[PDB]
């Protein structure tokens, strides 16, 4: 009577947990522990329906959706996985973890253009900096020059952060970008910080221009001083500007 005791144990556990979800239709630990108990059997066609009727009472929680998505990701079925990932990310756009784990599953998968469609939808919802510079690191880790330049023009118009103003000038330290580096430095000089400089952009500008030759390095730090903030600099960096100008030139007598 091994089959009798096996079905008796399974039927008692199923009946107890169905009475538990019948009593409380609010807390979501019961459905996920019941469904991972069926996931322990490793061969199921009914636990997907359990997760499907468990999200009808609560679709606003992250835990049930991410657990069913990681369960379907743990198995070898990828089509139903995409069929639940896309409705999860179109149901809850403002959360980040669903898009992160789906793009990480695609990191385990190939680099097809459907991934790029997912990433442009992920750009379309306007997330924070943590998503966007992660996507430009994604574009760096496959060595894309033209397309990473293409997706980066819409980056600056949303966040005018100085951490992003200094990193819009990154093709200088990647490709050296000369004529368009001068155009990007024009873009760095005409925008916001019209009379106060935001005290950080011209530091990196003079740093790359000292990494370059003596083209236009005298003008920006001392001769473009119309945009000062009450002393043009604090005490901590003015003599550093002076020695930054001194010992890195042609050194004429």
């Amino acid at each position: 009577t091994d089959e009798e005791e096996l079905n008796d144990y399974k039927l008692r556990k199923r009946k107890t947990f169905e009475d538990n979800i019948r009593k409380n239709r609010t807390v979501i630990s019961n459905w996920i522990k019941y469904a991972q108990w069926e996931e322990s059997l490793k061969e199921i066609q009914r636990a997907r329906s359990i997760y499907e009727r468990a999200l009808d009472v609560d679709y606003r929680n992250i835990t049930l959706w991410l657990k069913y998505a990681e369960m379907e990701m743990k198995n070898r079925q990828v089509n139903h996985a995409r069929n639940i990932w896309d409705r999860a990310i179109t149901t809850l756009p403002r959360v980040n973890q669903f898009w992160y784990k789906y793009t990480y599953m695609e990191e385990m998968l190939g680099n097809v253009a459907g991934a790029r469609q997912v990433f442009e939808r992920w750009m379309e919802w306007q997330p924070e900096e943590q998503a966007w510079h992660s996507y430009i690191n994604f574009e760096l880790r496959y060595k894309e020059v033209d397309r990473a330049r293409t997706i980066y023009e819409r980056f600056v118009l949303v966040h005018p952060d100085v951490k992003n103003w200094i990193k819009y000038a990154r093709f200088e330290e990647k490709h050296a970008y000369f004529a368009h580096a001068r155009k990007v430095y024009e873009r760095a000089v005409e925008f916001f910080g019209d009379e106060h400089m935001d005290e950080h952009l011209y530091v990196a500008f003079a740093k790359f221009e000292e990494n370059q030759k003596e083209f236009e390095r005298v003008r920006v730090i001392y001769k473009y001083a119309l945009d000062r903030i009450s002393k043009q600099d604090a005490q901590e960096l003015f003599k550093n500007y002076t020695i930054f100008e001194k010992k890195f030139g042609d050194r004429r007598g």
């Binding site: 089509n79 139903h80 069929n83 896309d86 179109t90």
Partner: peptide, 16 residues
């Protein structure tokens, strides 16, 4: 089939 049909318009972007 197993997967659903992909709906893309004539000119614009992929519709979801």
């Amino acid at each position: 089939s197993n997967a659903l049909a992909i709906q893309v318009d004539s000119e614009g972007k992929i519709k979801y």
